RNA sequence: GCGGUCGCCUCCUAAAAGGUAACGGAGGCGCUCAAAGGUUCCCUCAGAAUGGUUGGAAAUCAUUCAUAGAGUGUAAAGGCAUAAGGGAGCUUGACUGCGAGACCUACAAGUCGAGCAGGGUCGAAAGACGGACUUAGUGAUCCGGUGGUUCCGCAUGGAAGGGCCAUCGCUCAACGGAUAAAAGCUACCCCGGGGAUAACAGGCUUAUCUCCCCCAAGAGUUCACAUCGACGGGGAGGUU
RNA sequence: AUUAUUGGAGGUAGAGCACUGUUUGGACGAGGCCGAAUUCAGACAAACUCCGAAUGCCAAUUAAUUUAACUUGGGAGUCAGAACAUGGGUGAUAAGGUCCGUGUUCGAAAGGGAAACAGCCCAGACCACCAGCUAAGGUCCCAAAAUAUAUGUUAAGUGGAAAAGGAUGUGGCGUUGCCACAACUAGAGUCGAGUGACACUGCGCCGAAAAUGUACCGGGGCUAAACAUAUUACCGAAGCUGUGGAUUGUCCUUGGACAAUGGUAGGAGAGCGUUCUAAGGGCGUUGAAGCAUGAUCGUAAGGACAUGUGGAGCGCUUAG
RNA sequence: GCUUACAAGUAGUCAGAGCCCGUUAAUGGGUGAUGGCGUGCCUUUUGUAGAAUGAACCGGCGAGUUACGAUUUGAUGCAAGGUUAAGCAGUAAAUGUGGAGCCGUAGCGAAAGCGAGUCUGAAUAGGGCGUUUAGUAUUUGGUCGUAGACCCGAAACCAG
RNA sequence: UCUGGUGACUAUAGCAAGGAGGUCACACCUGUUCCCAUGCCGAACACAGAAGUUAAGGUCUUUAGCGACGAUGGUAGCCAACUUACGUUCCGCUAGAGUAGAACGUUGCCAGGC
């Protein structure tokens, strides 16, 4: 019945839908999407491309290849192959 | 190298995930049989939707 | 009702794809920078003690233990010794016209992109650059004002004027903006509605409330179990 | 769409102390009577990770089954949801509380069981029958089917409603040890036959007080008609089968089929009857329309035909 | 005519003695000793036997319509074409006559403009919308727009 | 086949001790006379030369003490499933981390004086 005292909190914002659009072993076009995330989780590797500090895209035709870089790094790349 | 699985049971309060496997071994209403081929993709199909059907033979 | 909030950014809740609510728990933004921007070189973190007018255990450059426990202009997470961290020269790409394709999404918006022409800075060069490590730092349309303004300018041509192209100013923070001119009281109140929503009683629940126990600390000079009853724990009742 | 073999993205349950923060202590440095930080063992975490499943998700251009799917247009309704079981937040590990997530049922679902009980268990009604086999739950009487068989457990009516505790309760699991222990007594000697702590138990006992009337086995009643197992037999639904028929959509290309037929807001299709008009052909004082009664005909809305009352108009076929 | 004074009842329905009947002639009709099963109807709801709303009973009356437009579907006529309006001589005959007009056969751009291509602009390059052409007149069904627009009902405002 | 040089592997590839050899080739070694240049001192950044040496690095061989990879046997957790009221319990699948016994002092790619 009485005024409450109320809440300092309330705030948030809008999710940017994050992670692998396209999957590993299937066909794509010159300049698709691969991933989008903040920083370089995935480091770009043959024939793809980063963007603005971002989504790694692809650069030529072809099936794109999830591999393992270094000792704890991963890569994503695309062949030729038809 | 031939089997014929029977439905002794009622596939209305499961969910749809086995509702479709039942249908996609091609029993229709209870008290139903069909007689197929033995094979690695059947043998894991009655597996998943079990405690349903009568396999034999 | 009073009070507090209303837009955008980061994390947890959120259940190893994405998405996901509450007056759930924490912080921020309404910028700043000619350099903190582009290019070519060059370098390297903390918590560690040495005994050095002086010492403020810490005012110094070393040295070695130094594994990112450091530093990033700004909150938080994801990243980075390619250093994305620290300096040095040169310069203005913080360029014009386009862009196959794709992510997001009710719609309006929003996000990234090989490369194609033109002109250039940097480097011996291969090459690199369409603003700051990445994600916040604004707000449609209408109207009004400015300049250049291969278009229509009406009986002919001039010609205020409209239109394409490029700028500028309000304030819409209740931040998808009712007309960018908006305060109260009804105990005389009136009509249309609702147990979708309060006051009395019923039902569920038992924090508080009233009992009953459990351990017994303390009170009786003896006798913790005559009696009182410290905290703490376990139940019942539905009469506050 | 589901499944079998394969590839990849990720950081939750759980673990862990390797970073961050927080702790308990034993030996650990940090004044002139008792300290910073550290060190060997360790402990905790929604905003801590060196680690890390099951399930789900995207592809597989891979076989076996199955029957959808996408694009454009016509017409819609919905924007108050609820309980149960799990995974969390909030509140008081309060609520038939409140807000999200994954399922099922109700909503829009009849039938059988839970004594009566939208949401719990079993199962989805096209219609006829005085046919048969089963599911959950059950078989002494009310009330369909065993006063069945074999084995244990239980003396409370436990079954047929709560907890910390409490104890010379107990059937099973291991001890421990006197060859004394029940009548010895220190606050020493015999005679004759079982004694106990402890440990895991399974079933009991006490803890247990409410207002109209026995008063939660549903009632009578039960020592098995209770509980835990085993095997059987039989009963039990509108589920399935048998026999005849109706409609569809298929199919085959004339009737055997193949399947299918709960339903609210809604979408689509085929029909019945009422008043008037047109054309053709009809009925009527030997009695029209209306009204009353009847044991008749069609899958439904409906349609004929006799008989009584009534005294002047009214049907049928095709179309509007 | 048949039935009723030991009985607990949404009044029915399924089975069933006895006592009377005799039709649109058929596995007929009226009455009901006993037994099993069973909490009306409409509206509004997450949910109603509800102690939520409405109606005493019976009869008569009482709620998606028409005019002009837009779009889509079926039907028919002609087909790169299709078709008329107001009129005028006529059974208020709605068949003749009437070619102002309307749609389609070619689009693209703010426009001037060019045209199977055009704008873009520094670009014929890459892209956007086009090109491969079936439409049209009347009528039938569905929905929508402007009128009161499916029907009934307000507190109140203004004029004389 | 030894070393020097390029391109694969999850530190199995290591830091912690050492052992021993040579300068064919990596090294310690001379200064600013020059190319470049430390807002700071040619140690890094450069030059001509090497009379002098093998410590160290460098390479093998030793230490499983120093840390990762860590095959089984279990077990927590979990997907179905039948029960009961769950902080459970039974029944089927996949079964972890940590703990051991271990492997453990890299497999090579392709060239140059041989």
């Known amino acids: 019945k009485k005024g409450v005292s109320s809440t300092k909190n309330g705030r948030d914002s809008e999710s940017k839908?994050?992670?692998?659009?396209?999957?590993?072993?299937?066909?794509?076009?010159?300049?698709?999407?691969?991933?989008?995330?903040?920083?370089?989780?995935?480091?770009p590797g043959e024939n793809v491309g980063r963007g603005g500090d971002d989504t790694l895209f692809a650069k030529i035709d072809g099936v794109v290849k999830f591999?393992?870089?270094?000792?704890?790094?991963?890569?994503?790349?695309?062949?030729?192959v038809a | 190298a031939k089997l014929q699985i029977t439905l002794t049971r009622s596939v209305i309060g499961r969910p749809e995930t086995q509702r479709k496997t039942v249908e996609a071994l091609g029993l229709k209403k209870t008290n139903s049989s069909v007689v197929?081929?033995?094979?690695?993709?059947?043998?894991?199909?009655?597996?998943?939707?079990?405690?349903?059907?009568t396999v034999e033979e």
Do not use: W
Not at chain 1, 17 to 35: E, H, P
Not at chain 1, 69 to 80: I, N
């Open chain 2, 36 to 53: 197929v081929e033995d094979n690695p993709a059947i043998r894991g199909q009655i597996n998943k939707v079990k405690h349903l059907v």
């Open chain 1, 17 to 43: 839908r994050l992670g692998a659009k396209r999957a590993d072993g299937q066909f794509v076009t010159g300049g698709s999407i691969l991933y989008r995330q903040r920083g370089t989780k995935i480091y």
């Open chain 1, 67 to 80: 591999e393992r870089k270094g000792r704890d790094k991963k890569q994503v790349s695309v062949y030729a």
